[PDB]
PDB file of all heavy atoms in Angstrom:
ATOM      1  N   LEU Y  20     -68.305 -24.956 -39.205  1.00  0.00           N
ATOM      2  CA  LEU Y  20     -68.277 -25.562 -40.517  1.00  0.00           C
ATOM      3  C   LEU Y  20     -69.314 -26.670 -40.598  1.00  0.00           C
ATOM      4  O   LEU Y  20     -69.574 -27.306 -39.503  1.00  0.00           O
ATOM      5  CB  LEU Y  20     -66.913 -26.180 -40.793  1.00  0.00           C
ATOM      6  CG  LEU Y  20     -65.666 -25.327 -41.072  1.00  0.00           C
ATOM      7  CD1 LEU Y  20     -64.502 -26.254 -41.278  1.00  0.00           C
ATOM      8  CD2 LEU Y  20     -65.883 -24.448 -42.281  1.00  0.00           C
ATOM      9  N   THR Y  21     -69.866 -26.823 -41.801  1.00  0.00           N
ATOM     10  CA  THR Y  21     -70.813 -27.930 -41.992  1.00  0.00           C
ATOM     11  C   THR Y  21     -70.525 -28.680 -43.187  1.00  0.00           C
ATOM     12  O   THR Y  21     -69.810 -28.298 -44.097  1.00  0.00           O
ATOM     13  CB  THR Y  21     -72.277 -27.327 -42.091  1.00  0.00           C
ATOM     14  OG1 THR Y  21     -72.212 -26.236 -43.007  1.00  0.00           O
ATOM     15  CG2 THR Y  21     -72.805 -26.863 -40.791  1.00  0.00           C
ATOM     16  N   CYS Y  22     -70.924 -29.931 -43.128  1.00  0.00           N
ATOM     17  CA  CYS Y  22     -70.605 -30.970 -44.248  1.00  0.00           C
ATOM     18  C   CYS Y  22     -71.865 -31.779 -44.524  1.00  0.00           C
ATOM     19  O   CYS Y  22     -72.373 -32.456 -43.674  1.00  0.00           O
ATOM     20  CB  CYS Y  22     -69.414 -31.801 -43.770  1.00  0.00           C
ATOM     21  SG  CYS Y  22     -68.882 -32.971 -45.000  1.00  0.00           S
ATOM     22  N   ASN Y  23     -72.288 -31.649 -45.790  1.00  0.00           N
ATOM     23  CA  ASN Y  23     -73.531 -32.338 -46.245  1.00  0.00           C
ATOM     24  C   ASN Y  23     -73.230 -33.669 -46.801  1.00  0.00           C
ATOM     25  O   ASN Y  23     -72.194 -33.890 -47.428  1.00  0.00           O
ATOM     26  CB  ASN Y  23     -74.231 -31.388 -47.210  1.00  0.00           C
ATOM     27  CG  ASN Y  23     -74.263 -29.942 -46.844  1.00  0.00           C
ATOM     28  OD1 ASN Y  23     -73.144 -29.350 -46.858  1.00  0.00           O
ATOM     29  ND2 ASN Y  23     -75.384 -29.420 -46.522  1.00  0.00           N
ATOM     30  N   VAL Y  24     -74.240 -34.558 -46.670  1.00  0.00           N
ATOM     31  CA  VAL Y  24     -74.094 -35.968 -47.019  1.00  0.00           C
ATOM     32  C   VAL Y  24     -74.718 -36.274 -48.327  1.00  0.00           C
ATOM     33  O   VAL Y  24     -75.493 -35.450 -48.846  1.00  0.00           O
ATOM     34  CB  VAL Y  24     -74.546 -36.877 -45.895  1.00  0.00           C
ATOM     35  CG1 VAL Y  24     -73.866 -36.498 -44.629  1.00  0.00           C
ATOM     36  CG2 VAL Y  24     -76.065 -36.755 -45.760  1.00  0.00           C
ATOM     37  N   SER Y  25     -74.588 -37.478 -48.861  1.00  0.00           N
ATOM     38  CA  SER Y  25     -75.442 -37.999 -49.883  1.00  0.00           C
ATOM     39  C   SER Y  25     -75.519 -39.540 -49.694  1.00  0.00           C
ATOM     40  O   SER Y  25     -74.475 -40.235 -49.789  1.00  0.00           O
ATOM     41  CB  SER Y  25     -74.910 -37.666 -51.204  1.00  0.00           C
ATOM     42  OG  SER Y  25     -74.856 -36.254 -51.391  1.00  0.00           O
ATOM     43  N   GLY Y  26     -76.682 -40.043 -49.405  1.00  0.00           N
ATOM     44  CA  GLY Y  26     -76.868 -41.496 -49.414  1.00  0.00           C
ATOM     45  C   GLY Y  26     -76.616 -42.139 -48.080  1.00  0.00           C
ATOM     46  O   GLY Y  26     -77.480 -42.484 -47.336  1.00  0.00           O
ATOM     47  N   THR Y  27     -75.319 -42.366 -47.776  1.00  0.00           N
ATOM     48  CA  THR Y  27     -74.954 -43.044 -46.488  1.00  0.00           C
ATOM     49  C   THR Y  27     -75.146 -42.118 -45.396  1.00  0.00           C
ATOM     50  O   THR Y  27     -74.718 -41.009 -45.244  1.00  0.00           O
ATOM     51  CB  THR Y  27     -73.392 -43.464 -46.630  1.00  0.00           C
ATOM     52  OG1 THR Y  27     -73.327 -44.568 -47.572  1.00  0.00           O
ATOM     53  CG2 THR Y  27     -72.944 -43.860 -45.225  1.00  0.00           C
ATOM     54  N   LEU Y  28     -75.883 -42.594 -44.407  1.00  0.00           N
ATOM     55  CA  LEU Y  28     -76.245 -41.756 -43.253  1.00  0.00           C
ATOM     56  C   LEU Y  28     -75.088 -41.576 -42.338  1.00  0.00           C
ATOM     57  O   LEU Y  28     -73.993 -42.255 -42.465  1.00  0.00           O
ATOM     58  CB  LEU Y  28     -77.396 -42.468 -42.460  1.00  0.00           C
ATOM     59  CG  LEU Y  28     -77.086 -43.527 -41.423  1.00  0.00           C
ATOM     60  CD1 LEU Y  28     -78.382 -43.700 -40.621  1.00  0.00           C
ATOM     61  CD2 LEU Y  28     -76.706 -44.828 -42.038  1.00  0.00           C
ATOM     62  N   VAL Y  29     -75.197 -40.684 -41.393  1.00  0.00           N
ATOM     63  CA  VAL Y  29     -74.195 -40.276 -40.523  1.00  0.00           C
ATOM     64  C   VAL Y  29     -73.809 -41.356 -39.427  1.00  0.00           C
ATOM     65  O   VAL Y  29     -72.716 -41.337 -38.904  1.00  0.00           O
ATOM     66  CB  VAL Y  29     -74.567 -38.905 -39.881  1.00  0.00           C
ATOM     67  CG1 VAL Y  29     -75.538 -39.109 -38.742  1.00  0.00           C
ATOM     68  CG2 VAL Y  29     -73.267 -38.171 -39.355  1.00  0.00           C
ATOM     69  N   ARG Y  30     -74.725 -42.312 -39.329  1.00  0.00           N
ATOM     70  CA  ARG Y  30     -74.436 -43.307 -38.236  1.00  0.00           C
ATOM     71  C   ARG Y  30     -73.412 -44.264 -38.747  1.00  0.00           C
ATOM     72  O   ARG Y  30     -72.633 -44.893 -37.954  1.00  0.00           O
ATOM     73  CB  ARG Y  30     -75.788 -44.023 -37.951  1.00  0.00           C
ATOM     74  CG  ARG Y  30     -75.679 -44.998 -36.747  1.00  0.00           C
ATOM     75  CD  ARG Y  30     -75.333 -44.118 -35.558  1.00  0.00           C
ATOM     76  NE  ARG Y  30     -76.382 -43.234 -35.236  1.00  0.00           N
ATOM     77  CZ  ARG Y  30     -77.420 -43.474 -34.395  1.00  0.00           C
ATOM     78  NH1 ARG Y  30     -77.542 -44.614 -33.837  1.00  0.00           N
ATOM     79  NH2 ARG Y  30     -78.310 -42.479 -34.227  1.00  0.00           N
ATOM     80  N   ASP Y  31     -73.287 -44.486 -40.049  1.00  0.00           N
ATOM     81  CA  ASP Y  31     -72.485 -45.590 -40.615  1.00  0.00           C
ATOM     82  C   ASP Y  31     -71.030 -45.480 -40.401  1.00  0.00           C
ATOM     83  O   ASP Y  31     -70.356 -46.373 -40.057  1.00  0.00           O
ATOM     84  CB  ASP Y  31     -72.924 -45.790 -42.102  1.00  0.00           C
ATOM     85  CG  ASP Y  31     -72.466 -47.100 -42.566  1.00  0.00           C
ATOM     86  OD1 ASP Y  31     -72.120 -48.009 -41.817  1.00  0.00           O
ATOM     87  OD2 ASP Y  31     -72.405 -47.263 -43.901  1.00  0.00           O
ATOM     88  N   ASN Y  32     -70.561 -44.230 -40.734  1.00  0.00           N
ATOM     89  CA  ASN Y  32     -69.087 -44.073 -41.116  1.00  0.00           C
ATOM     90  C   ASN Y  32     -68.409 -43.224 -39.948  1.00  0.00           C
ATOM     91  O   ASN Y  32     -68.937 -42.431 -39.372  1.00  0.00           O
ATOM     92  CB  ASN Y  32     -68.927 -43.389 -42.371  1.00  0.00           C
ATOM     93  CG  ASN Y  32     -68.196 -44.290 -43.431  1.00  0.00           C
ATOM     94  OD1 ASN Y  32     -67.257 -44.976 -43.064  1.00  0.00           O
ATOM     95  ND2 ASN Y  32     -68.689 -44.272 -44.668  1.00  0.00           N
TER      96      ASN Y  32
END
Side-chain angles (χ1 to χ4, degrees):
Chain Y
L20 290 178
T21 46
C22 184
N23 317 70
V24 305
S25 301
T27 288
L28 86 164
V29 74
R30 192 60 63 90
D31 193 16
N32 242 320

